[PDB]
Amino acid sequence: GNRRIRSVGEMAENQFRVGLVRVERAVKERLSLGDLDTLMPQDMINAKPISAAVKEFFGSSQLSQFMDQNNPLSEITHKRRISALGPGGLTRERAGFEVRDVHPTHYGRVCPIETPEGPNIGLINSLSVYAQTNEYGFLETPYRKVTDGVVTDEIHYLSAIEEGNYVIAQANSNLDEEGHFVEDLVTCRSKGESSLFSRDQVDYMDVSTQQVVSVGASLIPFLEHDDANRALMGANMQRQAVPTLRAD
Amino acid sequence: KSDDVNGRTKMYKNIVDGNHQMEPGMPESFNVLLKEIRSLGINIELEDE
């Protein structure tokens, strides 16, 4: 809830604004002293600073990356990537362990088992499968609203701070007859931690069992029987697989 | 095998001559270092004995 997402449209809007003030200063200077009857807008508006700034951004920013194109999973995981570095963000050499950890609010917004395994480990993340943004840029994930024990099919996208108030059921909790829970002491998570709760106290439920993991981490069969250190490397190494002669 | 020019030319032609023996000298990166500490206005020199 303290870290929003500054995407490509916002970044290119800001670089356009930088080029626009860099040319607005000069056109105000020209309009201050120049002639008036024959002064067109065309010869005083110069397309050099705006195009130069936006081409500099799109060609050589720290977030304008040469796309990985090994397989389709490589490109789609690159296009759903989240970088803590860049202009305005952190730096790789002077980041501690606290920014490189799995915060409990990553449940459903950021994958905990897909990241690089070098000096880039907590600083490059991956968007989860159902994760969205707000209009403000905070990550949100969908939940099914339960009412009087009846888990409905109404879907609410809860942001990072809104879900910290309610008790949200696990997706591995049992349902029947499109009704209610089959047990009383049901697991839930609330205010960070995760403890046992009653079957009527619950406020929400996860929309699916693959809500936590990303795209590439949800192609691994029997992922729940894997250690996380090896599941991370499997999700990494799927993106380096060359396409062979006959698909299988 | 590195930045000693006469040593590496003589080593190549000594190996082709069948005589595996080197005669080494000063690496050229040390002369680069001497010229850079001299260009910092600091007289460094190999004192002869």
Place this chain on the structure above:
Amino acid sequence: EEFDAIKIALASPDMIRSWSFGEVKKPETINYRTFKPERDGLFCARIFGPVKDYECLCGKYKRLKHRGVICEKCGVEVTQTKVRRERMGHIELASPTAHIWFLKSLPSRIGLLLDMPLRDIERVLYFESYVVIEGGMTNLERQQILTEEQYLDALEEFGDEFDAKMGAEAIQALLKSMDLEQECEQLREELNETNSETKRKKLTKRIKLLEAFVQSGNKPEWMILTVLPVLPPDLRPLVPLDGGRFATSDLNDLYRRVINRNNRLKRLLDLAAPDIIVRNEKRMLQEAVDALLDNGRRGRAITGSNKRPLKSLADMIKGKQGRFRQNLLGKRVDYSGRSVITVGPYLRLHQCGLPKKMALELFKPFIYGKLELRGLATTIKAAKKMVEREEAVVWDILDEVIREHPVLLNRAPTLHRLGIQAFEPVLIEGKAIQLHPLVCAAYNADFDGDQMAVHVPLTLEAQLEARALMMSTNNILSPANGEPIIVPSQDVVLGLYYMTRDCVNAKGEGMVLTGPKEAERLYRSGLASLHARVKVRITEYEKDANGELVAKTSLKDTTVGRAILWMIVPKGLPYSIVNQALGKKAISKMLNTCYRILGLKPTVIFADQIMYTGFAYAARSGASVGIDDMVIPEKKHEIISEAEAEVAEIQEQFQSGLVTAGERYNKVIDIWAAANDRVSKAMMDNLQTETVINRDGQEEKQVSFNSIYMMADSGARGSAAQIRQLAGMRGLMAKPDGSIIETPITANFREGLNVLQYFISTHGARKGLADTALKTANSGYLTRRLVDVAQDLVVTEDDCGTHEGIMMTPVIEGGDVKEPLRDRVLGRVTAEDVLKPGTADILVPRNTLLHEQWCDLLEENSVDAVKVRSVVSCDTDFGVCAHCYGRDLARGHIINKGEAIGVIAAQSIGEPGTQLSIKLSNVKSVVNSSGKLVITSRNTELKLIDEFGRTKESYKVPYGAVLAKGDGEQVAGGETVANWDPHTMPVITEVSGFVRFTDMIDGQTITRQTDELTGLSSLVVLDSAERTAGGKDLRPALKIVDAQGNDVLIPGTDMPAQYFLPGKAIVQLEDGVQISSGDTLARIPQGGLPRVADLFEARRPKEPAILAEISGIVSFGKETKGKRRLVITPVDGSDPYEEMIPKWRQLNVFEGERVERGDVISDGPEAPHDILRLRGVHAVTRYIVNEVQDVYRLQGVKINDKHIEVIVRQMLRKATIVNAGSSDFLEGEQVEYSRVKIANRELEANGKVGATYSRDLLGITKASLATESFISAASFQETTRVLTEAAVAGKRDELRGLKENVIVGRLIPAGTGYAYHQDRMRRRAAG
């Protein structure tokens, strides 16, 4: 090219003019239409030499026949273009400018010279203010800074008498006018009357700087540049890109800026410019020269086009990407290549599979040589086409060349010396190197994509060095410990375990066999199994007293597999090493036993045969992994439901509110820990004895044949925790901050976790996964610092002949022995004979290397401790002797001389950083009236002696404790017989009598009030902070007296026993009660790799255990201060020596005790500076060695202790003079300890006073920077400061060390270069 020193000093303007070849006068580099340099430019050919090889610029003189000829049309001499990287220019500066190093590299070297503030110096150089130089009147004193208003009024006042200038010319006039000898005499006579310590240390700084100047011969005005040298153009080249546009050379940009501003200053000075414009131009020239020398130092960094700061000369020297650390201490190399490694399990121990294309490329001049020597190629174009077409005769020549030519195989990072090893190549088809599977533990090389580098050695010296030193059949044992590194790993181990297991009714059991060949025939034909118990006739050879082998044949009770393995066990070993189920430890002990009994070649052949038989029989085993082999215990639901009932009961108790959240959390943590260990024990039992079902009489139990259990039990791969997470329960997973979560993961990896349990475990997964990256960064930095502190330490002598040493005792800290005496002393050399009555009165003589049988002699006679020599007490200056280092652990025999033991020690320490009866001593104690021994001394500890004379148990008895038993009698074990007050410390008196509340006022000295919870009137004493007006000068003293009031007496002394007690000592007793002799009166309440780094960097902790300086009576110092002050009154000497103690620091010893030198007076971690200063060299070695070996023994890492002693000896190389002798060592300055010992040696030779020193424990970084060699210090760290101080002091490196002879390029003084270097020493000495 012969030289024996490298000498640095400051550069004269005539010196820079003498290096010069012509003045650069115009800022143009080259013409850009025609790529030709300009006349007198930055690239000029008339100054810096011609461009083409043996041409002029105008192309008239083209041939070599005009070898050195100055042309006429252009004036550029035709010669080699090699001279463009040797010929420097110069720039005559239009005004003097200051050198940035001797102005900002702190200490400032000019504010230390003139004793001026750096703010005032920069305010003069910045043209902001004047400074007077000479005052003819008395009103003005020298080095006084005037503002411009003061300058104008003094200028109209005095007219012409004084002269104040401004800028770098003023400072150059000051340095030219000062008088160093008179200033040194004035400061030396000032140092007599100087009582202030800060003025004394500042004066010693200035005096040593002046003395360094007058002994070096530098003039002090050469810190102000007037001529500026210019780097040669081939050392700052113009690199064209591909698109016809040259690349930005930052040195060319900065030089061009200096030339532009200097030409403009010349034009302004000629044009009679106004003073504001002239001063602004001079300031711009000064900052441009400062940017060129060191860009990002004074102001903002001058940036280039891409908004990066420009590179300067100090950037080219300093840094990890600098000239030193990137091109002198390690560089790129020819005859080298790399590829991916694979397994060659068909190789011997000295072979690597090298691809054909790789070896053909690496060995091309050898192929040309053999092509000439065989006559198949006469012209070089013919030989080129023959090698390029890859003829079969060329492959025959390559197989002849490769034959008996070792190659070096290396895998980054080279954490220790066994990451480079010489192999003989086999030419294989393919593109991947084939590593032997036994050296993979030394290389740390698994086959998931690791790459390795081949390095061909060329000379016969290099080939024989690779054969006799670095061959993989010479490196059998580690240098770190003595253990072997050629150990079977997991597949050899699984195969040998499966071969030497046993069954009960396998196939053909109970047969009687003629021998191992018949057992092999039986198993191969299939008439028996590998585990069937048989009766084999076995002949084994044992060594006699002399080196012969006699046989003795018998009938054993083995399986078939142990008989088969006996065919490869060589002659000399017993059968008991093969008669059990061999795991990893048993196999490595078999290899070590074979080594110590037989030698090197039988161990090599035995390790290869072990590898082949283990691989073949693991292939024959078929041991797979399936989903049924991880058998879950059936009782898992029962234990989980019982712990669920327990947590429901504790949660119900919290609902009842009789328990709080903290005790609920702690209780549920203990409940789930007990449940986890019970389900782990049930899983391990049902897994390890699952094959109860057997036959031939009954159902007889046996060790299991489960696959997962065999991999776990053989030591091949796995452990109890990992098998627990596979089959039983996952366990208690922690939060990212380190707290434990009250519900655990109760599913294993066979059932599979849910979403929440996987999300819980990802915390610890990413914690470990980021921890590996940050720990390998810190491990690499620590290994670099250790190698650079201990690079020059070579064994240079054979025996120093000293009698010092360390008393190695078995570490008995805790309730157990950690390392026994055999492991702690095996391989040392005795500093003295063993002298005990003991059990047999053993005498082993002095200066004997303790072998294995000598360690067994120490075992069988149960010797307690032995003083052996160490490297920290070697009397050899400039190195150590061989006898104070003892056994070379990589070889086993005694160490030779010319060995880089410091590099071996530093690699051995920094390599596992990625893996990161009753007896009393110090008896001062009395008995109470209850017949029990109370303790009144804080430094007492109890030692349970045994019947054999050793100390197999030790404990520290707390202060305020009491002992139930006595001393010397047989103590019933199994219980800590003493009892202590663990929470509050009492104030026990040892003298009897009735208490009278004298020397105190109840209401003034204490706060007179009953205690708030008991109701009974108590004496709570308020501290010295909140005292009354009369409490600031006196303290409450509980004077224990007689029945009528006379003060009782300390027995033995004259001190009348009144006890000053401090605050927070709650006296519950009132007056009139009887106090015994031995009862109380009141009560007073109370990463590992960073630990290794903090112990080696000698970093002081924030709360040190304050130590008592001398022996005497401890009292309190000056009271009514915020920091309480302490003074110890000696019984013989004078000590008003005070110490400030902070607010929240307690006191362990009160104000009425007798303390000794080195007594702890406050709890906390000790500081090794204080440990050295108050307790000596052997004390600080024992502290550092035990404190590092604590961490290394915790993480299972076995390192010998002579390596840590080598590093401590390199830390202890400095001595400060406290009383001067008869040499010119004044007071309190750090000098080299070996030079001080040599000076005192010659002083006792010629019969004089001698000097008194004191050792200084420096950290690794401080010692490796304060080494007496500026090349090593500059190539380690802080190159700017090191070169600045060395250039000022005028030093010279004598090239005595490994780093200097690596940088310059000669043979190192180690190994095979030791003979040549001592040859050079005797040549330049006896010459």
Place this chain on the structure above:
Amino acid sequence: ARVTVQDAVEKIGNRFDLVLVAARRARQMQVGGKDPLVPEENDKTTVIALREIEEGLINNQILDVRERQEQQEQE
């Protein structure tokens, strides 16, 4: 010593001057063309020199008295 040189180390006493004396003997066989006292077995001159050292035909002082007697018979 095509496998290991511990026998030649047991002959001399110190691996470093073993490397130096084997280098001098290998240079006398490769450059000088002096006769290998051990049969060749189609080997490189370094392994022939190490074989001669391990057999015990040459040493440092043996090589010095050999080159000294060559200098005496020529000059």
Place this chain on the structure above:
Amino acid sequence: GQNMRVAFMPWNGYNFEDSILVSERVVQEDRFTTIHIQELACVSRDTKL
């Protein structure tokens, strides 16, 4: 990738430490054969000569 018939057993040390032994039918049937297209350029420039 492709679906491979996999046996879990040690085979003569040829899968020692994360190594893989592959049949020759996987190389015959061309299952893991990949195509690698590579672009080389040649620029005709206007030299001043």
Place this chain on the structure above:
Amino acid sequence: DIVLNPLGVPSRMNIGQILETHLGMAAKGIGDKINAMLKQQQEVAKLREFIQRAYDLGADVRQKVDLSTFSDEEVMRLAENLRKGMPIATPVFDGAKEAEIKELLKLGDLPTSGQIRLYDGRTGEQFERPVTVGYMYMLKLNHLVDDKM
């Protein structure tokens, strides 16, 4: 086709390797039986019955496929695409249990424990223990010795 090492499993604790091997053995067994029926050219009713039995096999699974609406050309096309092995979905944290894996192995006439008895290729002898044999999904990463050498 590929011989992997069993000693890489119980230290790294990736048991999805072993479960994917067993489920791939079951899937390839179903594909072998469909290929046998197609090569013998049995009928459309036999194919419809067997493919339906393989489809509605799980415990209480959510997929309901019914070949009654499938016309015969579509059943022949489906059997042709299934003749190399029936593909099996398994969502993350919603997997197939070992009971369902063993049920599919029992349908495919294969061993229930997952392990068969293998013979040595060279000596012709037999490995003394049953060896886990199945069908993992292997990838070819872009770190090739043509580029590293």
Place this chain on the structure above:
Amino acid sequence: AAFRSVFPIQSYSGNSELQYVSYRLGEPVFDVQECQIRGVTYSAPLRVKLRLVIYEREAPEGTVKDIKEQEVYMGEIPLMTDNGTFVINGTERVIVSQLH
């Protein structure tokens, strides 16, 4: 939003100002495959209508003196294809989202 953040702009005195009317984007000169073949970026021309008025400072409030409305060309912006990538100088790039 970026146009309204800076427009309008007055003079150093206030005798003229520049009003923004509307912007539009022209058709790209090449399709995506043509840019990937030719080695040029895949962009579009940015054409924006502006309004230039002149305040008659000789008058008290001289609003209308000269009204110019021509089409101005303010550089280029590279478009995003139908898969979320950008083609910059013929090569294919991806602008990764940031978490600040």
Place this chain on the structure above:
RNA sequence: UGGGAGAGGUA
């Protein structure tokens, strides 16, 4: 030829 940045990856 060959220098510097930035990005990603392997052990």
